[PDB]
Design a protein around this motif. Sequence first.
Motif, short mmCIF file in Angstrom:
data_model
loop_
_atom_site.label_atom_id
_atom_site.label_comp_id
_atom_site.label_asym_id
_atom_site.label_seq_id
_atom_site.Cartn_x
_atom_site.Cartn_y
_atom_site.Cartn_z
N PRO A 141 0.80 2.10 -7.91
CA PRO A 141 1.82 1.05 -8.07
C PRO A 141 1.09 -0.27 -8.37
CG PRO A 141 2.25 2.46 -6.12
CD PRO A 141 0.83 2.71 -6.57
N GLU A 142 1.76 -1.20 -9.05
CA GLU A 142 1.05 -2.24 -9.77
C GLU A 142 0.48 -3.29 -8.83
OE1 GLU A 142 5.14 -4.63 -10.91
OE2 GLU A 142 3.56 -4.53 -12.48
N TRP A 143 1.05 -3.45 -7.62
CA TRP A 143 0.55 -4.46 -6.67
C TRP A 143 -0.18 -3.81 -5.47
CZ3 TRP A 143 -0.15 -8.53 -9.47
CH2 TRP A 143 0.83 -8.99 -10.39
N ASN A 144 -0.57 -2.54 -5.64
CA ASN A 144 -1.23 -1.83 -4.54
C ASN A 144 -2.45 -2.70 -4.16
OD1 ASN A 144 -2.85 1.12 -3.45
ND2 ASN A 144 -0.67 0.70 -3.03
N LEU A 145 -2.51 -3.08 -2.88
CA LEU A 145 -3.63 -3.81 -2.32
C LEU A 145 -3.82 -5.16 -3.03
CD1 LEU A 145 -6.21 -0.94 -1.61
CD2 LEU A 145 -4.30 -1.57 -0.14
N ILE A 160 -6.39 -2.14 4.16
CA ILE A 160 -7.25 -1.00 4.49
C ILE A 160 -8.69 -1.44 4.35
CG2 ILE A 160 -5.45 0.53 3.58
CD1 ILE A 160 -7.35 1.23 1.40
N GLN A 161 -9.56 -0.73 5.05
CA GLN A 161 -10.99 -1.07 5.08
C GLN A 161 -11.56 -0.66 3.73
OE1 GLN A 161 -13.20 -2.49 7.38
NE2 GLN A 161 -14.57 -2.17 5.64
N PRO A 162 -12.09 -1.62 2.96
CA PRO A 162 -12.61 -1.31 1.67
C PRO A 162 -13.80 -0.36 1.80
CG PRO A 162 -12.29 -3.64 1.87
CD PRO A 162 -12.21 -3.07 3.24
N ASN A 196 -9.49 3.38 -1.29
CA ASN A 196 -10.52 4.30 -0.84
C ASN A 196 -10.99 5.30 -1.89
OD1 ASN A 196 -11.49 4.44 2.28
ND2 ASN A 196 -11.77 6.46 1.33
N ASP A 197 -10.23 5.46 -2.98
CA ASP A 197 -10.65 6.27 -4.13
C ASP A 197 -11.46 5.48 -5.16
OD1 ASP A 197 -7.37 7.75 -4.01
OD2 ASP A 197 -9.20 8.51 -3.05
N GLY A 198 -11.56 4.16 -4.96
CA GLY A 198 -12.31 3.27 -5.85
C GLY A 198 -11.50 2.80 -7.04
N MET A 242 0.83 -1.18 0.00
CA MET A 242 0.00 0.00 0.00
C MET A 242 0.88 1.25 0.00
SD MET A 242 -1.70 0.19 3.82
CE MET A 242 -2.06 -1.56 3.90
N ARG A 243 0.26 2.39 -0.35
CA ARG A 243 0.90 3.73 -0.46
C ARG A 243 0.76 4.46 0.84
NH1 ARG A 243 -3.97 5.18 -3.24
NH2 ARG A 243 -3.31 7.11 -4.31
N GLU A 244 1.55 5.51 0.97
CA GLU A 244 1.42 6.38 2.12
C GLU A 244 -0.01 6.89 2.27
OE1 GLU A 244 4.58 9.20 2.59
OE2 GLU A 244 5.91 7.51 3.28
N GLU A 245 -0.68 7.23 1.17
CA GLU A 245 -2.07 7.69 1.27
C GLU A 245 -2.99 6.58 1.82
OE1 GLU A 245 0.18 8.27 -1.27
OE2 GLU A 245 -0.98 9.25 -2.87
#
Lengths: 256, 256
Positions: free
Chosen positions: B146-150, B167-169, B134-136, B98-101
């Motif tokens: 990034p390509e493997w985010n989540l 993170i909570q979907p 969280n942005d969908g 996951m990203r910092e955001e």
Amino acid sequence: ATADTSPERLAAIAKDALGALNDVILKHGVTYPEYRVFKQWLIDVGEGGEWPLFLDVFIEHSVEEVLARSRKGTMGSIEGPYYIENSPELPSKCTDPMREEDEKITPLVFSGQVTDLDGNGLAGAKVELWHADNDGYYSQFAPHLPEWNLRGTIIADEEGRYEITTIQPAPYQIPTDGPTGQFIEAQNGHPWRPAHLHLIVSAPGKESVTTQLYFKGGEWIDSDVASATKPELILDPKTGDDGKNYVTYNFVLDPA
Amino acid sequence: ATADTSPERLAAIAKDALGALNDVILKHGVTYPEYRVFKQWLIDVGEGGEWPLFLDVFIEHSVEEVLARSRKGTMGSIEGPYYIENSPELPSKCTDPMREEDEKITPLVFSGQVTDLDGNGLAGAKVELWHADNDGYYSQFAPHLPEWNLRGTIIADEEGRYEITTIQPAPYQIPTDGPTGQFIEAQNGHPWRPAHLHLIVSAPGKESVTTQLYFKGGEWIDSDVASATKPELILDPKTGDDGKNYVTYNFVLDPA
Ligand SMILES: [Fe+3]
Ligand SMILES: [Fe+3]
């Protein structure tokens, strides 16, 4: 293309359409691998430019069946994907534009009258005719053909009469090297339509009719892949001593 | 993609599918103008690259409903169009890339065990997890991610156990600026899915399961546009004093 359709109307259509397709999946036990092949085939249909082709064969007949309910005049049939507007106007007695190779074919002399529901002849009437050559090609959908080959708009006389000479249509093979061909070949289907004329016939104050005419005894008459042939639309031409095939058929238009 | 399917099988599927669609046209009296809009919309779906999107929303649930009939283990759900194989392997206790955001979001700690039908823990088991930010957005379907985010493949321990932090979907909006959006907007539909995790869980000798997990009380739980949520797949996480949401869910696999 625009329709009138209300969200509520769309919703209802979509719901039974989707619900019916889902019912078919459950009924047959459609598998994941089959779902994947279906998804790729849809994509292939679009990439191949075959939406008009596929839909007119397998769906249009139902849409004309609806339109037929409100009509009392001559039976309609599907348009198919090859109608072109503004084909060059011709006199009430005429021959269709054709090539020297088309003059080799047995001629068809198509006569008749455009009338109202009571049989009165209609002034101002037009007969738009298009059909395939003996090679199974439509002008404007075959790079080698002049653009109005076997196409015209016949200006009917003051009594609604016409006499149109053309070539005798031959059975028509749907294009088979695309996704639609694949689909038909894959179920041992028959990619063929009976020989046919396409016509749109129109008169002032009257509802135009899009229809087709076929030939008694012809191959595929009882097995049209498009499900578009009707008993009422079958011509029985008679051959004259000149070797030409003669047939008369009247058009009967509903009010507009 | 290839299937096993016999011509006779295809023919039967095609016949009731086409027959059902034709029945819907007759039932609603679908008009020529509506037929033309339908034909252009099909073309638009292909041109827009939305076949996977449209089908997974409106068709896949039926295909999983079939597959469900032969299964006794945990309920499956649709895959949707955003699964990617070979996501990077992770230890049985881990957090998703996951990203910092994404670290701003309330964490979800998902624990459990992969078992057979009798509740025995399975060695060799894997949990492949992917879900939206969280942005969908889904990584690999959003140029900024990034390509493997989540995304990861969780290597479960010797007893089949895992503890996965992510993170909570949040509720997921289907992409609406294309033909599919147009279709949903045009019937006053709701282009939304409830918040969800996607999972494929697998073990040697066992049939993998593709499924999804949702959240008790969540928006759109009772109105998933994809018709893909099941009561059995609803998690009820508990919030700890660290502010994180904890939930345990076991996977129960059928034999292969
Ligand atoms: Fe034709
Ligand atoms: Fe999803």
